Amino acid sequence: VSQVRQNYHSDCEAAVNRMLNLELYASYTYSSMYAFFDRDDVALHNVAEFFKEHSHAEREHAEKFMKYQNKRGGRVVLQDIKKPERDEWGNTLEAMQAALQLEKTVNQALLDLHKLATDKVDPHLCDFLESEYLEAQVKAIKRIGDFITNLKRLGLPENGMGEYLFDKHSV
Amino acid sequence: VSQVRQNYHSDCEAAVNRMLNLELYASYTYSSMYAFFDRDDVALHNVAEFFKEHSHAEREHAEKFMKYQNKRGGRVVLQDIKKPERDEWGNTLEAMQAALQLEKTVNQALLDLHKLATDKVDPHLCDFLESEYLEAQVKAIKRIGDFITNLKRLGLPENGMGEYLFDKHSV
Amino acid sequence: VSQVRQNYHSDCEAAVNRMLNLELYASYTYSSMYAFFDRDDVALHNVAEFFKEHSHAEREHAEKFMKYQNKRGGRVVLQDIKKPERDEWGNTLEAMQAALQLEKTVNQALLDLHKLATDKVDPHLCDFLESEYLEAQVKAIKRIGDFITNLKRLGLPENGMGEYLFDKHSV
Amino acid sequence: VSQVRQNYHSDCEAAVNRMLNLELYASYTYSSMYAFFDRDDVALHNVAEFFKEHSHAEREHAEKFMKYQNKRGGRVVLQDIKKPERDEWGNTLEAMQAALQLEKTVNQALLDLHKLATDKVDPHLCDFLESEYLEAQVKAIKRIGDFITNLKRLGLPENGMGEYLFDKHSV
Numbered sequence: 001v002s003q004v005r006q007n008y009h010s011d012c013e014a015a016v017n018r019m020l021n022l023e024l025y026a027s028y029t030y031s032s033m034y035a036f037f038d039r040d041d042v043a044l045h046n047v048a049e050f051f052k053e054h055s056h057a058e059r060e061h062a063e064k065f066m067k068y069q070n071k072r073g074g075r076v077v078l079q080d081i082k083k084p085e086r087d088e089w090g091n092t093l094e095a096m097q098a099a100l101q102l103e104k105t106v107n108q109a110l111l112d113l114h115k116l117a118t119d120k121v122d123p124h125l126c127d128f129l130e131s132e133y134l135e136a137q138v139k140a141i142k143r144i145g146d147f148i149t150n151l152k153r154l155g156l157p158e159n160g161m162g163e164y165l166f167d168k169h170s171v
Numbered sequence: 172v173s174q175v176r177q178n179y180h181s182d183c184e185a186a187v188n189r190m191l192n193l194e195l196y197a198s199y200t201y202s203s204m205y206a207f208f209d210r211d212d213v214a215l216h217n218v219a220e221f222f223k224e225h226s227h228a229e230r231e232h233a234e235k236f237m238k239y240q241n242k243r244g245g246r247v248v249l250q251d252i253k254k255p256e257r258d259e260w261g262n263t264l265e266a267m268q269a270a271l272q273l274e275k276t277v278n279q280a281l282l283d284l285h286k287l288a289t290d291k292v293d294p295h296l297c298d299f300l301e302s303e304y305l306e307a308q309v310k311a312i313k314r315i316g317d318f319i320t321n322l323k324r325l326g327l328p329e330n331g332m333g334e335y336l337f338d339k340h341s342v
Numbered sequence: 343v344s345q346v347r348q349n350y351h352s353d354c355e356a357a358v359n360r361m362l363n364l365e366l367y368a369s370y371t372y373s374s375m376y377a378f379f380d381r382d383d384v385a386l387h388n389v390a391e392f393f394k395e396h397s398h399a400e401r402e403h404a405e406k407f408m409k410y411q412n413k414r415g416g417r418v419v420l421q422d423i424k425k426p427e428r429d430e431w432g433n434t435l436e437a438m439q440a441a442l443q444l445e446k447t448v449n450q451a452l453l454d455l456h457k458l459a460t461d462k463v464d465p466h467l468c469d470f471l472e473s474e475y476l477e478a479q480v481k482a483i484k485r486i487g488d489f490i491t492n493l494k495r496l497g498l499p500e501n502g503m504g505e506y507l508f509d510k511h512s513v
Numbered sequence: 514v515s516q517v518r519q520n521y522h523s524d525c526e527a528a529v530n531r532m533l534n535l536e537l538y539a540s541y542t543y544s545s546m547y548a549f550f551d552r553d554d555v556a557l558h559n560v561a562e563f564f565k566e567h568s569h570a571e572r573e574h575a576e577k578f579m580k581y582q583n584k585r586g587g588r589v590v591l592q593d594i595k596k597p598e599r600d601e602w603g604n605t606l607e608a609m610q611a612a613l614q615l616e617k618t619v620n621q622a623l624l625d626l627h628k629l630a631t632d633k634v635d636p637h638l639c640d641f642l643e644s645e646y647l648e649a650q651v652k653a654i655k656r657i658g659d660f661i662t663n664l665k666r667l668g669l670p671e672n673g674m675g676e677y678l679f680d681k682h683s684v
């Protein structure tokens with residue numbers, strides 16, 4: 001047992017490792033979206049940069065779980081980072097729809113971890129999730145939803161002019 | 172009788188209280204429009220902010236009548252602030268049309284109060300309306316009319332691209 | 343269903359709308375207290391300004407619930423803002439006593455909403471209340487209680503000199 | 514006839530001369546109040562300074578009517594400035610009560626001049642009164658009324674401690 005460990009259930013330690021992996025998975029998916037929008041036959045550079053920045057943020061989310069694990073006396077256990085679900089992302093609307101789903105998947109995992117922490121009577125882990133993750137998730141989901149609404153208003157997927165306008169004025 | 176009261180008719184005092192209520196009603200209507208345009212399925216944030224700012228201005232208009240009432244020795248009497256006429260505002264054109272009508276309703280009440288003040292030979296109240304309210308109303312009405320003209324030119328309500336363009340370049 | 347909605351119970355959405363209304367009600371009550379203390383026959387301007395500022399803060403509390411509702415994918419539903427309980431507020435002690443009661447009423451509604459959020463397993467809503475509302479309420483209640491104690495020490499309601507001194511040195 | 518004169522009735526010209534005299538009379542009354550509160554056996558120096566400043570403001574009001582008269586092509590006609598009604602002013606409450614009455618007398622004369630200007634269809638004179646005099650009068654009356662309310666709360670005339678406190682914290 002780690003000399004620092006106190007009130008930290010094995011189940012929570014394991015679930016933190018799984019959550020770390022999911023953050024890394026999300027990072028990698030956003031990196032793929034960046035690369036897609038940077039293609040010469042896609043060429044929506046502000047959209048590409050949005051996804052590149054999102055990829056970096058998800059890596060920071062992962063690193064914060066690594067630090068957390070060690071602060072509590074748990075032990076970081078890494079698994080493979082699975083490649084993203086798609087190799088190509090269609091267009092800005094399809095990518096944003098996939099991003100919304102990804103953010104909701106991550107949010108559900110965070111909510112499930114909060115449930116576990118509650119069950120194991122771990123207020124420090126509850127606070128960490130509430131203070132560092134849950135509101136950031138709600139904000140990200142709202143932003144992407146707002147984007148999807150605008151992409152639909154702009155006539156995506158068919159309206160290429162609309163797609164151009166979005167990249168030039170929304171991101 | 173208030174020790175400060177001079178040349179202030181009871182009818183004018185009552186009409187100032189009614190006008191205060193109408194300013195608060197206008198504020199509340201604009202708050203509703205703000206909340207509508209901030210919805211994830213509407214997502215026109217510059218339009219939302221325009222209405223939020225308008226809501227704050229109407230509250231200032233109300234507060235200025237409260238201060239006026241007390242300066243003249245009248246007594247502020249508050250009534251319920253009725254909820255807005257609609258719960259949802261359709262789109263930018265419908266909302267701007269409702270805002271135009273609201274501003275004209277407020278303007279008519281101000282003009283009617285000026286008529287009353289004239290009838291009761293109250294030049295201080297006439298001056299207050301002319302110096303603090305009537306020109307602001309004319310300016311607001313003109314601005315909203317100009318917006319409606321542009322929204323129609325942009326093909327509202329059907330043209331979603333036009334609606335997007337308005338939010339990005341007119342507000 | 344809103345595309346952003348996740349883990350947000352209908353009961354919580356409705357209770358947020360009711361809480362929004364109560365914040366607006368509190369704002370309006372403080373506006374009435376402002377207007378009372380600004381009367382020429384009351385004339386306690388620092389007290390009036392305290393209540394005017396409190397009125398503005400309550401409006402901000404309401405606006406933050408509107409924003410919250412939309413972030414979660416709920417839909418803002420407005421109701422009439424009821425006029426305050428009194429048209430005149432007696433004196434500084436009576437007004438502060440009413441303010442204490444109002445703040446405790448608002449606090450109880452916030453605590454009840456936290457209970458509901460807990461029952462529905464909504465940690466984001468719990469965090470929002472804890473981080474943005476509950477401590478502000480405790481602070482406001484303590485401040486007003488401290489004022490009441492001082493007003494009683496100063497001999498309110500009978501001691502007009504005491505009332506004058508409070509306005510000049512406590513606010 | 515003056516080469517500049519246009520739409521300026523003889524009655525209005527005469528009434529402007531009478532109004533000028535009344536402003537000078539008000540100045541002189543406030544000078545007397547200054548001198549009273551500066552007496553070694555009265556010794557309320559902040560009150561004295563309030564009245565001295567008011568005396569200077571009334572002289573400015575008079576000078577503005579002189580300038581107005583000449584701008585319209587009327588001819589300034591001066592009369593004696595009558596000495597104030599009292600040689601001694603009792604105490605701060607009595608003086609403020611006399612000041613309130615004086616300001617209301619001046620206000621009534623301004624309102625009567627506005628009536629005359631209206632009757633003679635002189636919008637320039639109406640504007641001058643509304644823009645330069647009537648609101649200043651309402652503000653001054655409100656300020657003095659507020660002071661009287663506070664002096665009564667402080668137990669004037671009997672409560673010398675209250676009178677001291679007013680001079681140290683209200684002016």
Ligand SMILES: [Cl-]
Pocket residue numbers: 005006007008009
């Ligand atoms: Cl442990």
Ligand SMILES: [Cl-]
Pocket residue numbers: 007
């Ligand atoms: Cl424990």
Ligand SMILES: [Cl-]
Pocket residue numbers: 008009010011
């Ligand atoms: Cl364990």
Ligand SMILES: [Cl-]
Pocket residue numbers: 013014015017018077
């Ligand atoms: Cl593990």
Ligand SMILES: [Cl-]
Pocket residue numbers: 017018021022079
């Ligand atoms: Cl894993």
Ligand SMILES: [Cl-]
Pocket residue numbers: 079080
């Ligand atoms: Cl694996």
Ligand SMILES: [Cl-]
Pocket residue numbers: 085086087088
């Ligand atoms: Cl693919």
Ligand SMILES: [Cl-]
Pocket residue numbers: 101102103105
């Ligand atoms: Cl997903």
Ligand SMILES: [Cl-]
Pocket residue numbers: 015112113114116
């Ligand atoms: Cl879990």
Ligand SMILES: [Cl-]
Pocket residue numbers: 130131132133134135136137
């Ligand atoms: Cl967060």
Ligand SMILES: [Cl-]
Pocket residue numbers: 139
């Ligand atoms: Cl936000």
Ligand SMILES: [Cl-]
Pocket residue numbers: 154155156159
């Ligand atoms: Cl289209």
Ligand SMILES: [Cl-]
Pocket residue numbers: 176177178179180
């Ligand atoms: Cl009157």
Ligand SMILES: [Cl-]
Pocket residue numbers: 178624625
């Ligand atoms: Cl009159």
Ligand SMILES: [Cl-]
Pocket residue numbers: 179180181182
């Ligand atoms: Cl009347």
Ligand SMILES: [Cl-]
Pocket residue numbers: 184185186188189248
């Ligand atoms: Cl009324």
